[PDB]
Amino acid sequence: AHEISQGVYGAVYETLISRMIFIATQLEKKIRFVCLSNCLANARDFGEWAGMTKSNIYNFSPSERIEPLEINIQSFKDVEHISFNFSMLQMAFEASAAAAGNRNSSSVFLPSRKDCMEVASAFMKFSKAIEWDMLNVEEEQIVPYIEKLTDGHLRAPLKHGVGILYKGMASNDERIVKRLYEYGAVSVLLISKDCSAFACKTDEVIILGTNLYDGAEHKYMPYTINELLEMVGLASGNDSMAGKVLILTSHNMKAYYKKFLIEPLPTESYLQYIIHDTLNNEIANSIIQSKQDCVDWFTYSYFYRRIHVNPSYYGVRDTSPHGISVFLSNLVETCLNDLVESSFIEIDDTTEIISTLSNGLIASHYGVSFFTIQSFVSSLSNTSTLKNMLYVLSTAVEFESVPLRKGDRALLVKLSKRLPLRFPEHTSSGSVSFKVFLLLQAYFSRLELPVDFQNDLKDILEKVVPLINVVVDILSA
Amino acid sequence: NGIPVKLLNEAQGHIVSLELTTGATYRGKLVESEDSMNVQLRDVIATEPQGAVTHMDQIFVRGSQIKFIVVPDLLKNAPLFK
Amino acid sequence: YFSQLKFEGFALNSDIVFIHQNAGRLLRAMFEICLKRGWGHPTRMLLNLCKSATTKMWPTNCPLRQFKTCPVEVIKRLEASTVPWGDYLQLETPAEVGRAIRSEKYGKQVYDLLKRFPKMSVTCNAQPITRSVMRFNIEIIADWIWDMNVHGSLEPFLLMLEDTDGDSILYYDVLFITPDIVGHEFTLSFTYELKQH
Amino acid sequence: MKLVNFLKKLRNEQVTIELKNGTTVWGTLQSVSPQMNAILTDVKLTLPSDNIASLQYINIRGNTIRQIILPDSLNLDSLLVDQKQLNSLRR
Amino acid sequence: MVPPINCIFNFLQQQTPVTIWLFEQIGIRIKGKIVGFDEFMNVVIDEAVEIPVNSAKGTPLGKILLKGDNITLITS
Amino acid sequence: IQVAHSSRLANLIDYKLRVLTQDGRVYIGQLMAFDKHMNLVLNECIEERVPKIKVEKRVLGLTILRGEQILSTVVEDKPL
Amino acid sequence: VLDPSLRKLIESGIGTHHAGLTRSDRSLSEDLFADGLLQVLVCTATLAWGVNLPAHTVIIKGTDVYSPEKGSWEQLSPQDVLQMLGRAGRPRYDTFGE
Amino acid sequence: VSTPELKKYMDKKILLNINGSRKVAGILRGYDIFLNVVLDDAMEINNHQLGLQTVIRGNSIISLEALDA
Amino acid sequence: SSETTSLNPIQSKVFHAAFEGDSNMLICAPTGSGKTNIALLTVLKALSHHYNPKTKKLNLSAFKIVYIAPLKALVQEQVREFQRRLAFLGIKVAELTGDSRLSRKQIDETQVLVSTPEKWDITTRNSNNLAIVELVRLLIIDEIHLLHDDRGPVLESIVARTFWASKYGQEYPRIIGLSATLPNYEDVGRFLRVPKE
Amino acid sequence: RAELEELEEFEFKHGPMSLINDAMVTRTPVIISLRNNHKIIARVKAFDRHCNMVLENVKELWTEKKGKNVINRERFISKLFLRGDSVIVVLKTP
RNA sequence: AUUAUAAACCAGACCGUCUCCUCAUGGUCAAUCAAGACUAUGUAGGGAAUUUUUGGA
């Protein structure tokens, strides 16, 4: 329940908790909640929202952890516009060999598979000339373990005491890699940011780059603190009474992580954004029939019970039990009066009634953003073609959860050669939409997809089936 | 526009000689000029590579099949340029 | 040097040569130092100085000057006229521009060379993360049209956050606007702790 | 789009162009036109090794060329598919 | 007066006898009847027969669409 | 031959150029008028023949050239 | 383009070159020796430091160079003197160097 | 695009020299911008008649002396 | 231009040595006495290990030569010479267009650098220029006797960098001292890791 | 402007070029013809509108016979630019 | 009285530092009852199958 901040895929989650709470006070039901989470600075407030008493609400310090962790944060010049630099790499290497020379075992975190590859060769280079390039083990032992060779790019890095881990290997290969760490064979493991889920417990933790590229905004972002947490989250098993994190940051984001890895994460709503879709859904379910129902719903939520503390975060200048209420009302009006412009809902005077149209109803059923549904509405019409439909699908808001790494646009362009359909003239080439369009074709035509893109494709496909249903049964409507 | 065309136009009423693909040279008056370099002549001399030279009254020539066209030295600096 | 005053008595000219080769350096260094310190007054002024050094002209010398392709008569007209430059940039119609560049000739050209000039309807609301901490959500629009001869491989922009006075920098960053960015309503965030007072 | 856009990029490279009537001419490409008119600073000749007829600076009419070879051994191509799209910023 | 763009129309209408001429080999020339309306000089001609004409002859042929580039005579 | 790193046709206007044609008849003449087709008007014509060894000469005209049958243009000796 | 009042000297045939002669003027002064005609070249140290141009005879006036380093009149530094001498004789053409 | 000024040459018998040693003659009934001469006589070189009216492709027509000046 | 077709009194002793063994060499020998020629020879020797006699394709990406002249004029002079005597193998011998640090990647593609000691130091100190120095096999140091003047502190620094710093590659490039005749040739040799060879 | 020419992009893959497009996509050897008694072979790489093509690993096969004979001369060429007017027949071989 | 010479920062590799011609574009001018030369945008095109540069060797 710390992740109810992070973005909106958060606010989604937040929503559900709120919904559950509401249900509990509409089914008079003895529902139990167990809100397990990170250390949160505000967390009493959160608890209060989540139907609790000060007794049951156990917010702690992160220093209360038990394998005590020494976080070393290291900032570098010229980094804020790149993933990692050479000084950083050097530092990592130094720290890596410090672990390998000791009994401890370290793991580096990185942005992506490409990054890992870059590190691996570089790491090897660093090693060769220096004493340490040992696997703690013979050169003819490892080849038996890596008989399968898929992908073969892992082999050569893996062969000299420096393994790879990226999102979506051959599962068997991944397992083998894991075993090689656990067993004590492989010395250092390189990890892509996406693979934080693959919790291989390590002693030292290198974080090479707190900065992640994305065609999202055509620019390098920063590892949002949740992501970082997983590496402070994974601690030492071998050397008890010791934990260690080398962190390779920007000078700017020292002061973010220097604050927010040792102190509790502050919790704030992103509900403010999504309310359009959520509200629509609520309306469809028909508990909402008014401009006070919405307010009531809000009141059974984290937004309302958060906003009272930091309201300047959520833009509430008045800050009074009147003023706040007024603000809320305004917000709900805003939410509604988009949903009247788009074909979502209807309102009339006699307290005063609210009801759906298909557009709204379909959205509610299939869980697709008002934003996305609006987009769908205008481009889809009578005598729209298959290609057009595909294009429309590809510009759903949904796919903002799809990475576009450094040089992925180029790759896409290259691929465009082998495609059946072609994209429209009047849209962007950097956008996720473009990626979606080509990576819908990429598996329609049974193509040879790069293992990076495979993940992306999978992600896209996670979304598509509701979206396609919507498309078919917006047209039907 | 193309300056050679302009020059040609200007030299309407000059003793212009010629040379074609085959090499059948000529030398008579310039009757008219066009964008595509179509030419007509008067009192035209026929002096071919075959040897059998003749004297013809009028002749019209296709522009595409021209190799080059001869002009006198009068319209050299002025007035066509600036 | 800033004003381009190439010389007769070349001893001076020799001396000025040195400055030319080494001014931009020193000025840049000074600017950097200021930035590090966190001092507004010089650093903005220092940035200006640096720019001048780079492009051999003063602040009051009208920026068109720094395109390769604009003509001399126009620049002179621009200079004397005592118009807030921004006004010219704001103007919409090339005819209008022509009318108000004392030269209805080249008006279109100049317009093309104003939609060829950098310019950003930036917006930025901050939100207080916690008591000390402040996120600042910046929304930078790049309103200009790129050109690989003119604007270069990228268009840097040293973003300052600075105080109510304009004395002290709070937090700064370089950001490279790329061709790719331009026009996209593109965000940028940073967090700033605060002073007790 | 076009393969003359390929030779548009290659400023200043050494080639020995096979012309249609048959010739060997080592020279610097400079800038080629969209009607394949290239500009050649230094030259070696063959009038109809083959004898050096003693010319230096040629400028090609783009009709003449059969085969261009040996400026550079690379493979880099596209451009217009990028530019059409990133100009769609605001409606 | 007779323009050639309307001449094609006439040809289409009447269905006349024809003797087409070629470029490279002056000796070989085609004979038949022209059919098609077209913007290029290209036209389709049923009952094509290439004949060796006396340069200073029993040879028949099938049916042809001759390229607009290589046509050197039309008679109607 | 003395001719420098000349970038384009407009930068080498009014030079005494050798010119080459389809049949093999070589020319010499001062370049007057650039064009789309390279119908380059010469200040004076001296065409030269070789039989199908050794080169001959002619001098009839001061010509407007036509581009169709040209091969390429080469500088001989600049004016002034 | 000869500005100062050195043009008269040039005309006479005993010119000079120093940091303080124009990029072109100074180049000219150099090249007015390499074309051949300059009979005598007065100077300050620049030539020795920079440009190869050897000339069969070389005088060096003075002892005390005033360095701003000290803020005082020194004597001639050997590291400079030797360099100056190194012009000496014309290596390609002539026999020795005065 | 510019029309050939062959209204001068209209209704006069012309002695052509078409491509490849081919001397043909006929009256100019009709002309065009492409030069596809719509002429009304066809005889070869001595002489023999072959076809009455004849439309030729302009690409293969070069020299055309009007018999009547 | 093989005028004499036979090397001077200096090179005739050194030539074999230059070609024989890749040692850190050094020559204190009279001013304007085939130093350039010697340098060229050294360069050629260096190139031997990368560029093949059978496969005449020049091995570009591997070797990168540096030339530390003291004066910019001198550098300019020498660049031309380099171009002249190594356009046959087809070497692109440029002096440095420095400009900016992250922009200093022109130099990475170039084969031979003639750069001023100060400039070199700037190049070799800055972070994303470490790639350059590893490709540097040939550091040629003209007029080392500058060391005595307050400039050649930079030379000393450079030397220090070349030995001490690059240990994470650890593959030390060939040094070639060049100078006019001066004593303490022993000391200099010691400094530069030079034997009696 | 954009639609009128870019629609002809699929006209490669439908029209008579389709074969050579395919070849280009999956590099394969093809007989390459010319005007003056010529025969050429190579694999396809980059493709255009008007047959101005580029290939790799190229073999020229042609004759200079001064006296009623055949002398099939052979030389290796790489990364060319044949002007498409000269090309006549090309075909994908197995 | 009055002072040698001399080197230097910073953005760049995921990236088209740079076009000869025609058409349109708006702003101009030079002008007669609806048409021509210039800057400027590349947003157009260049097998317009024949009058030129995509095939008569």
Please give the structural blueprint.
The structure is cut from a larger assembly and holds ten protein chains of seven kinds.
Chain B (H helix, E strand, L loop, with lengths): L2 H8 L4 E6 L4 E5 L9 E4 L2 E3 L6 E2 L2 E4 L4 E6 L11
Antiparallel strand pairs in B: 1-2, 1-7, 2-4, 3-6, 4-5
Chain D lengths: L3 H6 L4 E3 L1 E2 L6 E3 L10 E2 L17 E3 L4 E3 L12 H7 L5
Antiparallel strand pairs in D: 1-3, 2-6, 4-5
Chain E lengths: L3 H11 L13 E7 L8 E10 L11 E3 L10
Antiparallel strand pairs in E: 1-2, 2-3
The structure holds one RNA strand of 57 nucleotides.
Which characteristics define this entry?
part of a larger assembly, 10 chains, F: 80 residues, mainly beta, 5 strands, globular, J: 94 residues, alpha+beta, SH3 type barrels, 3 helices, 4 strands, 18% helix, elongated, RNA-binding
Describe the structure.
With 82 residues, chain B is mainly beta. Chain B has one domain (1-82): SH3 type barrels, CATH 2.30.30.100. Chain B has 1 helix and 7 strands. In chain B, 10% of the residues lie in helices and 37% in strands. In chain B, the strands form 2 sheets. In chain B, strands 5-4-2-1-7 form a 5-stranded antiparallel beta sheet, with no helix packed on it. In chain B, strands 3-6 form a two-stranded antiparallel sheet. Chain E has a single domain (1-76), classed as SH3 type barrels. Chain E has 1 helix and 3 strands; from the N terminus they run H-E-E-E. Chain F has 80 residues and is mainly beta. Chain F has one domain. Chain F has strands at 16-21, 27-33, 41-42, 62-65, 70-75. Chain F has a 4-stranded antiparallel beta sheet, with no helix packed on it. The radius of gyration of chain F is 13 Å and the shape is globular. The relative contact order of chain F is 0.31. Chain H has one domain (1-69): SH3 type barrels. In chain H, the strands form 2 sheets. Chain H has a 5-stranded antiparallel beta sheet with strand order 6-3-2-1-7, with no helix packed on it. Chain H has a two-stranded antiparallel sheet with strand order 4-5. In chain H, a hairpin with a 7-residue loop joins strand 2 (25-30) and strand 3 (38-39). The radius of gyration of chain H is 11 Å and the shape is globular. The termini of chain H are far apart. Chains in contact: A-C, A-D, A-I, A-J, B-F, B-H, C-D, C-G, D-F, D-J, E-H, G-I. Chains B and F meet through helix 1 and strand 7 of B and strand 4 of F. Strand 5 (58-60) of chain D pairs antiparallel with strand 5 of chain F. Chain C binds one RNA strand of 57 nucleotides through helix 1, helix 5 and helix 6.
